[PDB]
Structures are given as C-alpha cells and as structure tokens.
Design a protein around this ligand. Structure first.
Ligand SMILES: OC[C@H]1O[C@H](O[C@H]2[C@H](O)[C@@H](O)[C@@H](O)O[C@@H]2CO)[C@H](O)[C@@H](O)[C@@H]1O
Length: 463
C-alpha cells in the first residue's frame, strides 16, 4: 500500500527476540505516543527488496549487514546521521560493516558468530577436531545417542568448515573485494565439503537435517552436540539441559572460520518517519536496558554497544562467541553476496543429497556466484536460445523486478529473438539482485541452457 506517517513498522527475523524489541516499542510509545509495530515476516531478506522497490515495506529493517549493500545499490536504504559522540558508544569495526560506498546505511546492534554447543552431562571433553567426530559418533550411537546435529539447509552453518582449509567468498584485495575472484571451488573448499558429504555417506549426519530437527534433538538430549548462534541459548536454557559453549572444532589443524554477521537496523528510503526511526534506534534500542530487553527474549550474544558488552564480558558463552568470531571473517556487504549465498546453498544441498558430486556442485557454485557477469557476457547466445519467456517474465514480476507495462512491452515483440533482446537489456540496468532473479529463473526453468553455455565457454577458454 503505502507507509503510514506517524507510526513505526519494524521487520526482524523470527529467530530474534522480537517480543523483547516490542517491549522497547511500548516504552517508545508511552513516552512519545508513537505506535511501534514489530513484525517477523517469513523470508524477510527476500521480501524486503521486493516490497521496498515500490516504496512499500517497513520503516525499519533488521538483518545481518551482508545483505545491506544489495539494498543500498537499489536505493532502498536511507543514509543515517549519528553524531560523533553517538558513534563512539559503538565499536569502530561495527560501523565499517554498515558502510557502503562511503555512506553509513544502518545502525549496528549485535555481533553474531556461530559456536559449538555441547551437552555437558554427556560429553565432558568436546572434541577439538572435526576428524575425531566420526569415531565419536560410533561410540555414542551405542548408547542410543548421536554425536552432532546442526542445520544443513542454510549454508551459513556449513560455511565455517568449508572455509577452514581455505575456502573463501570474495578475495579481499587490500581495501576492497574482487568480484571475479571467488574461492568456493578451490582445494580447501572441496576438502571441507567433501568431509561434510563423507560424514553423510558414513551416516554420521543426514542431509535432511534442518533447524527444527537439530534443535529438538539437542534439547531432548538425543544428540551430543550442535552448531548455532546465541539466539538459540534461550531454548536450551528452558530445557534445563546442562550445556557449554566453546570454540568450533578444527579441520586439518586449522580453525573453523565462521562468517561473522553484524545484526543491523536500516531505515527504508521511502519512509516518512526517518527521524522517529533514528530516535527509536539511538535513544531507546541502543542503550543498556533496550539491549537487555531484547536479550531476555532471545540472546543477542556479543553486541556493538561498548557499555553493554563490558557487562557481557564476564559471560563464558560470550567469550566463546568472540573467540569464534575472531577466528572467522566479517562478511562483505557487497551486492554480490546474495548470489554467493544462493550458489553455496545450492552446492551444499546437491552434494549432501547426492545429486551432484562435490566437484560438480562446487564447479557450478563458482559460476552461480558470479551471476550478473554471466548474463551480460552471454548476452548474444541468450537472445537466440532462451525461448518462451512466460515463466521467466512471471518470475521477474513475482519478484517485482518488472512492472506490468515492462512485461507487456517484451511480449509485444514479433519473434523470440526480439522478445529475448528486449528482456535482456531491461534487466541489466536494474542491479545485481535483479539479474540474480533472472539468472535463477533461467537456471530453474531452463537448466540445460545454463549448463550448455557453461560448457561452451570452456571450449572457448581452452582455445
Ligand atoms: O545461510 C545463508 C544466510 O546466512 C546469514 O543468515 C543468518 C543470519 O545472518 C543470522 O542473523 C541468523 O538469523 O541466521 C541466518 C542463517 O539462516 C546471512 O546473513 C544471510 O544473508 C544468508 O542468506
């Protein structure tokens, strides 16, 4: 519809303390009279750039910083204006994570990193290595219990192992990232994922495992270990299970390298309540009591606010979190991250399910990760061989990449070539997120064509 003036609508992920944040809104409402509504829509990281592109959506959006460059590229975010004194209340490295092209485009909240969570009354000495987990799983299964269960559907949770022996997203080149240098196909990436797959072949893990299965199994005492972030600590607490949080196990003598996310709050560019949002985030949320209100619901973990993090220092769970973070990497915020994640999500699920080899799964990821480049570079061949656009046009429209008028202009053309030509040029101008949708649509609806071009480009590169 349109964004209501004199009100604040907030979006935050369903695994965060959204009831706690709503408590902060109530305090803001009591003092200022401004209503604050907190929501947690399914797949909000996808849903946001769809609705915001038309000038709809929440006043404030919460997500890890890695998606925020894509949003900023599309002009969905407003530039924020905290004073120098405000900025000093937070760690410098958290401001860096929310800087896109010299502009601050979000307020940092929480520093998120995965850790190894273990049942104390079942495993006094957690294994320091991934290697000894197969042996640990055989002797644990004799007692009707398993060694390790964690979410295998989201690449976030498998990435630490994949990166440990040398897998990386985009190569950092002394100041910036090179979007042509992807490291999902190297030997370290292959070896980390091959280990994961081998765990499954040897039936120490199952490819079907998601968040729901992994969480219930641990909190029932059915599995010895899991891998998760701080937000999951509440559900383990209430289950009265005695558990510890510690450094992730090593792979080949190298530490697991989790991708660190800075949970951040961006303000919709189309919002008429930017000042209200600033007041809410600076004066109310980013205070000791505001952060604790959220934490009571779901733990934030380590946080960006200096004064609050010092009080969290005495917590061994927080220390384990920052240790794990410091052995990992802060995620890039570049627009190509969405394509990176899609590429790794697909590679893991396919290798783990057995429908691709690790080599074939990762070979494709290398190409899927560089979405936009692939389409522009194969512009000539696509124009000729793409074919019927109905499903693709629908995809682009469902995802709000094209308007109705734009779709109909493509459908106007007399032949398939002129139709293809019209569509191709229009999408390239709309950003990385739009070409992702186009690439994914073509990959989903005509998978052969992508494989074919992938293969024709090899013969062109060989000669
Ligand atoms: O699995 C890919 C996924 O990883 C990260 O998502 C995290 C998120 O940062 C956390 O705040 C938490 O909610 O769990 C999510 C994992 O399911 C990336 O931030 C995200 O963009 C990416 O798609």
């Amino acid at each position: 519809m349109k964004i209501e003036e004199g009100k604040l609508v907030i979006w935050i992920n369903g695994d965060k303390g959204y009831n706690g944040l709503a408590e902060v809104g109530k305090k803001f409402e009591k003092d200022t009279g401004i209503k604050v509504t907190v929501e947690h829509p399914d797949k909000l990281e996808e849903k946001f750039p769809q609705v915001a592109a038309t000038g709809d959506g929440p006043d404030i959006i919460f997500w890890a910083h890695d998606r925020f460059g894509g949003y900023a590229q599309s002009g969905l975010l407003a530039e924020i204006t905290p004073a120098a004194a405000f900025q000093d209340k937070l760690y410098p490295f958290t401001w860096d994570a929310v800087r896109y092209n010299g502009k601050l485009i979000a307020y940092p909240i929480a520093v998120e990193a995965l850790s190894l969570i273990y049942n104390k009354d079942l495993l006094p000495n957690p294994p320091k290595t991934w290697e000894e987990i197969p042996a640990l799983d055989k002797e644990l299964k004799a007692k009707g219990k398993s060694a390790l269960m964690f979410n295998l559907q989201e690449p976030y949770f498998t990435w630490p192992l994949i990166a440990a022996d040398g897998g990386y997203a985009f190569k950092y080149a002394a100041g910036k990232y090179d979007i042509k240098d992807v490291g999902v196909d190297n030997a370290g990436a292959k070896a980390g994922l091959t280990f994961l797959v081998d765990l499954i072949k040897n039936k120490h893990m199952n490819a079907d495992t998601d968040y729901s299965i992994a969480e219930a199994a641990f909190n029932k005492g059915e599995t010895a270990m899991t891998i998760n972030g701080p937000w999951a600590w509440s559900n383990i607490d209430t289950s009265a299970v005695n558990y510890g949080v510690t450094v992730l196990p090593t792979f080949k003598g190298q530490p697991s390298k989790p991708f660190v996310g800075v949970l951040s709050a961006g303000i919709n560019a189309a919002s008429p309540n930017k000042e209200l949002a600033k007041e809410f985030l600076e004066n109310y949320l980013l205070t000791d009591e505001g952060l604790e209100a959220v934490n009571k619901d779901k733990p934030l973990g380590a946080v960006a606010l200096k004064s609050y993090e010092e009080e969290l220092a005495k917590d061994p769970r927080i220390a384990a979190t920052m240790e794990n973070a410091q052995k990992g990497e802060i995620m890039p915020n570049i627009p190509q991250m969405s394509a990176f994640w899609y590429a790794v999500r697909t590679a893991v699920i396919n290798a783990a399910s057995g429908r691709q080899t690790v080599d074939a799964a990762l070979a494709a990821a290398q190409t899927n990760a560089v979405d936009a480049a692939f389409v522009k570079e194969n512009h000539r061949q696509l124009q000729a061989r793409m074919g019927d656009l109905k499903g693709v046009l629908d995809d682009l429209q469902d995802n709000e990449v094209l308007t109705e008028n734009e779709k109909e202009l493509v459908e106007q053309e007399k032949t398939r070539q002129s139709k293809n030509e019209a569509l191709l040029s229009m999408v390239e101008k709309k950003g990385d997120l739009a070409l992702d949708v186009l690439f994914r649509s073509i990959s989903e609806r005509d998978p052969y064509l992508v494989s074919y071009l992938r293969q024709q480009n090899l013969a062109a590169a060989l000669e």
